[PDB]
Amino acid sequence: GPLGSILFRISYNNNSNNTSSSEIFTLLVEKVWNFDDLIMAINSKISNTHNNNISPITKIKYQDEDGDFVVLGSDEDWNVAKEMLAENNEKFLNIRLY
């Protein structure tokens, strides 16, 4: 249930312009997941709403303690991400699509 999960936000952009209407999905990312299992959940989220099939995403940036978007393409990067919200007592996270 709500226990043992993290609110992940993905501002899926169309083409990034003056008009595209960005969509932010909210999925509960478990703590027993991995970097691959994470990027996989996001992919299904894009196909869950959009009937079409865009290019498979494999690069996303998460929000750190400063508020800047840091690259996340490694396994260790995911481990630290959990330790980040752990000490910060956080619960959610802002991610950007590229």
From Swiss-Prot:
The gene is CDC24. Residues 5-98 form the PB1 domain. It comes from the Eukaryota. Interacts with AXL2. Promotes the exchange of CDC42-bound GDP by GTP. Controls the polarity of calmodulin, and the calcium regulatory process of bud emergence. CDC24 may be involved in the initial selection and organization of the budding site. This is Cell division control protein 24. Disulfide bonds: none annotated. Present with 1010 molecules/cell in log phase SD medium.
